[PDB]
Design a protein around this ligand. Structure first.
Ligand SMILES: [Zn+2]
Lengths: 364, 140, 63
RNA sequence: AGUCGUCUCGGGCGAGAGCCCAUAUCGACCCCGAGGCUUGCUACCUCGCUGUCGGCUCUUCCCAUCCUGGCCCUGCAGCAGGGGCCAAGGGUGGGGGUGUUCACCCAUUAAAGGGGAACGUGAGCUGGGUUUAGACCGUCGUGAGACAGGUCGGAUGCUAUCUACCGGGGGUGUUGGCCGCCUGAGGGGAAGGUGCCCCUAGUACGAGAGGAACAGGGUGCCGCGGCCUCUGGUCUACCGGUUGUCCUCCCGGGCAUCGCCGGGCAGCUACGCCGCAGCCGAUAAGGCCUGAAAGCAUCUAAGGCCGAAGCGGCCCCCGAAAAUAGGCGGCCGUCGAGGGCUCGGGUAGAAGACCCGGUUGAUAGGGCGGGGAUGUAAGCGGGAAGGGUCAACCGACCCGCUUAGUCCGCCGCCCCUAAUCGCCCGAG
RNA sequence: GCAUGAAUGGCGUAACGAGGUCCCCGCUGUCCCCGGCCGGGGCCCGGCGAAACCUCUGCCUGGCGCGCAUGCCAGGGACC
RNA sequence: CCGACACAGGUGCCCCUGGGUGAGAAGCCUAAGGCGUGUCGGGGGAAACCCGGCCGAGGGAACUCGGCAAACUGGCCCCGUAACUUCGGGAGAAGGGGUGCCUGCGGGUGCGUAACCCGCAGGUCGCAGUGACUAGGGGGGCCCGACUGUUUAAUAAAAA
RNA sequence: GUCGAGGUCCGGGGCCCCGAAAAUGGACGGGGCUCAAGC
């Protein structure tokens, strides 16, 4: 007989092409009864480690253990749109979408330069860097009529879902000015309840503390670090050819048999590696910190920023998340998180674990 | 419960790196009669195509005796690895490494053949094989 | 969560890093970095380097 | 290629062997087949060339199933065995001699299955065997010489025309143009597979020896997708030591693989670390209920309930060229929304493309500060084994000013400098 | 001794050999299992500027066929 | 000059060679002399892959027809050196220790405190002192041919 | 010995069923067809 072995690489992530957009998309949402927005967004900052008393079931329960964590900076999101979905012939179809009128912006870090007063920024100016075509002469009265029409459609019952359109605020943390516009689902079983939940916070700011719970599992969605064009040895993990090969060692030997008289798509080849849309499952949210600081035991507060700052990143100044393990993406990449969609049967308790040490030493 | 005091095997919370492949030479750290052994296999291990079986601290391997007493040479024995040169991480995150690659000859059930163990014995191996830790003089 | 002390430079290093070396006679050494470990094993004198805690003792002995 | 004598695999009958008992198991003598995986037979295609065996690399398929999932009979007490049924999602490994396929052997393992793809794969590799030209031995021949007899040596060419697959771009169409957010028709997945330990339990069973299972916990290995906090490798950025020579000597430099050696942050990596649902629905073998044909009986003829690692869904990746060529909000047209080149840089990169910034300014440089890497600079003062007219002076090296000096493909603050000017397309 | 043998020499042999062959210490990326770095190509821009080769063309599954079809039959799919 | 060429071949390297290190006409640096014409340039974290080179944790031939390739050793001085033997050899067998710089003495030849060479004592620095360069890995059986030498210019260097 | 209408056997004829396992995905020419669009 011959020798058997599993094939090189997985066919479940094909085509291995560049991501359609740098902003991740979410295809599936968890089913929940609590009325809350199902996820959040942030920017990847860096990695560090802690020592914590383990609370998850297993052999090392109750013993102090090492744990790598990733810090994700999450300035509050701006809720500025509401979208309604009806049931079409082949799936959900959006029926209407209402956004709030322009309002003054107060969290913009304006600075006095030589001459001229404060810039006095307003909304629809930062949003213009993403949309570029915003309503003109839009008034609170017209916004109220549109919201009333959407509500009337909900009462009639043509609407089967409602979602919240939010925008990031990188100018708060001084990362950049162009925001990311995303759509988020709201848990619950009542369309009216979801609509009221979105309406009460239209035009407002939402913080990660009001959304997510410490110690719960999450799914992390991002675009992985790009590697450019890579050969089959790195892309699919094939074996190097024999050292006596005079035509090269980092290539596939045979790319197919005589019949079929074509190259099958399953043969490993060089191509784009990295910068792929990926989803990671069951990452625990260790802790949530406010204003770049983490409280430990009601009398100690530490700065999560390591000495000298995060490598290739500034200083954390806003609310942040501590995610156990590693997350896909590069530094400053936009990261989306949602409640875990397939959690294990025996999940860890929904509370912050006992933390005994947090590393804040220089990471460069 | 079963095998209350007669148990021979234990559980360790730390999994040392498998840094000793097939064909490695280990020093026998007890007075069983053998001095140097060579790994020819690892039990409770499944490999893959063209992959050599590897083992680390606290692992039982099949070895052949290369140096020792004439009644022990050219014999196929079972040995538990107690010291390895390659560093491995513990629960607190610190790495630990030893001075040499040392093993203790035991029966297939885990009962040591010798009467005393010479040199330090790794904590992971000591908890994995209770009989070894009983006769070990230094545990680290 | 206890800071260990390097056996070469004499300084404390944070939990979760560093390494521990065990000699065949049971003595235990702690190394904060591969640099300190390599210097200790190659035999560089720690009493001549101003960045080592042993340098203070050496200078006290020399007066 | 045709054929199946032969080969591999089945079936019909039942002489019997099994303490009685043909069918738990083996099944004589005969008889009927399937496959094209052994060999042979024919000489139908190919001699103005279709490059061989074995091995390595890589992809895929069949079931006559080796293990994993579920069952039936037993001459099945348990632990195990023998025979058979459904089932191809996954696995089926490492070594010794030999060119070997095969076969034999070793230590593990759940098992270490048989085959097809031009005896898959030389415009992918290697060239050990075979099958030229050189040579030796044995045998045969008067001889030249020969041997499906051994033996040593004996070359592997390529700028891709079309198509194929992997990734990357410009267009047209989608009944006017543009920006943003979505839907998911269809395609792909193994994204998971499989051991062991504790307990049940020294319990059921069994005279004893021995010795389960449901449920409940823990963990290893193989496979897959990510990351650089820890560890390790590299680090021709950088820092230090040192040899030969040259720039006259000091400092500071060139060359000698980065001259060599030790350390080394960022980056890249693995030997490092993190993540990978068991539930629902219909079924195969099989176990049953009701029930007549056939007043009884009967799992089947009609009907009904359960029942697999197998099928469909939940999950993940691609996805408006999905020709029924989609939905919604907004801006624009019947001068003009929007965009491109140019500008400063990378969360990106072979060209394209993509992403941030562009005075609505901290994008890069520069200045200052933080953090880090080496390891205490030049200069001066002193000491130094000794020499020296035991004077002056020379002297490797050591101590103090000195956590110094040098450097940073990391961070923060400050508009001082450059992100300017300009050009072009564009629906009607 | 299928089928060795004594000048088509027999047996042995120190020294010698880029001859064939087996083993041991040491050594190592041959391998487990591959990962970094440097210089030259590859890639893009400005120039000089060919050749081998070429019936016309050129998507697949099952078939018929001089018995292994891009072009034939029935189906499938495919904008350039 | 010949090879169709402003051809990496051959004819002709045919005759000659300052300084330092060093046994050296070796390697490396450098003076004189010559050249930038072994003649297409520019860009780039601008990839995959190929050719040439450096390094690689733990293991150490488990790779493979076969340790192919690579790696170890390496100069000099002093101890020490086996089987066998044609007594010449094997042999640099094997194996072990040392090696820089500074200070000062002693010795050989020498008229010389000129030049070359050989020792001694002390001090001291580094992971490493033949620090770059130059520069053997070693041992034990068997077959064949005694040896040095010759051969199929263009697939066989051999036991022929 | 009680019910109280056809059962018992054999040899044949027509259609159908079991016997009936293969390798790129696929062959009644295809779609499909059941008092047929089969015999
Ligand atoms: Zn240290």
């Amino acid at each position: 007989g011959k020798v058997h072995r599993p094939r090189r690489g997985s066919l479940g992530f094909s085509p291995r092409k560049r991501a359609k957009s740098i902003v991740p998309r979410i295809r599936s949402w968890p089913k929940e009864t609590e009325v809350r927005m199902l996820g959040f967004a942030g920017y990847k900052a860096g990695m560090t480690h802690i020592l914590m008393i383990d609370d998850e079931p297993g052999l090392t329960n109750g013993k102090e253990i090492f744990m790598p964590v990733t810090i994700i900076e999450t300035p509050p999101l701006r809720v500025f749109g509401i979208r309604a979905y009806r049931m079409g012939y082949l799936g959900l179809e959006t029926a209407t979408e209402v956004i709030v009128p322009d309002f003054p912006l107060d969290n913009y870090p304006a600075k006095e330069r030589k001459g001229k007063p404060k810039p006095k920024m307003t909304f629809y100016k930062l949003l213009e860097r993403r949309i570029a075509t915003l309503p003109k002469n839009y008034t609170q009265e017209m916004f109220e009529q549109k919201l009333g029409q959407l509500e009337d459609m909900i009462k009639e019952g043509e609407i089967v879902d409602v979602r919240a359109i939010v925008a990031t605020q990188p100018w708060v943390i001084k990362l950049k000015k162009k925001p990311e516009v995303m759509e988020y689902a709201i848990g619950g079983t009542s369309v009216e309840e979801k609509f009221n939940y979105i309406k009460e916070k239209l035009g407002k700011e939402l913080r990660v503390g009001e959304v997510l719970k410490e110690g719960e599992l999450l799914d992390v969605i991002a675009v992985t670090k790009g590697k450019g064009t890579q050969g089959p040895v790195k892309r699919w993990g094939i074996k190097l050819r024999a050292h006596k090969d005079s035509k090269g060692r980092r290539k596939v030997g045979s790319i197919g048999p005589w019949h079929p008289a074509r190259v099958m798509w399953t043969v490993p080849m060089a191509g784009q590696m990295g910068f792929h849309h990926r989803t990671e499952l069951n990452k625990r949210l260790i802790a949530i910190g406010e204003n770049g600081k983490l409280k430990l035991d009601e009398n100690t507060e530490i700065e999560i920023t390591p000495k000298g700052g995060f490598p290739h990143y500034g200083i954390v100044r806003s609310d942040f998340m501590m995610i156990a393990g590693s997350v896909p993406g590069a530094i400053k990449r936009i990261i989306r998180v949602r409640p875990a969609i397939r959690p294990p049967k025996k999940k860890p308790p929904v509370q912050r674990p006992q933390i005994t040490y947090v590393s804040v030493e220089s990471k460069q | 419960a079963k095998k209350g005091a007669g148990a021979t095997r234990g559980v360790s919370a730390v999994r040392p790196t498998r840094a000793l492949p097939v064909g490695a030479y280990l020093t026998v750290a007890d007075n069983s009669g053998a001095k140097v052994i060579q790994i020819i296999g690892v039990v409770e291990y499944h490999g893959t195509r063209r992959r050599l079986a590897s083992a680390g601290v606290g692992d039982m391997v099949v070895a052949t005796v290369k140096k020792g007493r004439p009644d022990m040479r050219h014999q196929v024995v079972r040995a538990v690895i107690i010291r390895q040169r390659k560093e491995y991480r513990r629960l607190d995150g610190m790495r630990v490494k030893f001075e040499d690659n040392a093993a203790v000859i035991v029966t297939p059930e885990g009962v040591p053949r010798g009467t005393e163990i010479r040199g330090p014995v790794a904590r992971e191996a000591a908890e994995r094989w209770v009989r070894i830790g009983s006769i070990a003089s230094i545990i680290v | 969560a206890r800071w260990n002390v390097c056996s070469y430079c004499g300084k404390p290093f944070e939990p979760g890093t560093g390494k521990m070396y065990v000699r065949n006679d049971g003595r235990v050494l702690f190394f904060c970095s591969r640099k300190c470990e390599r210097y200790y094993f190659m035999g560089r004198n720690p009493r001549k380097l101003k960045w080592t805690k042993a340098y203070q003792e050496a200078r006290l002995q020399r007066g």
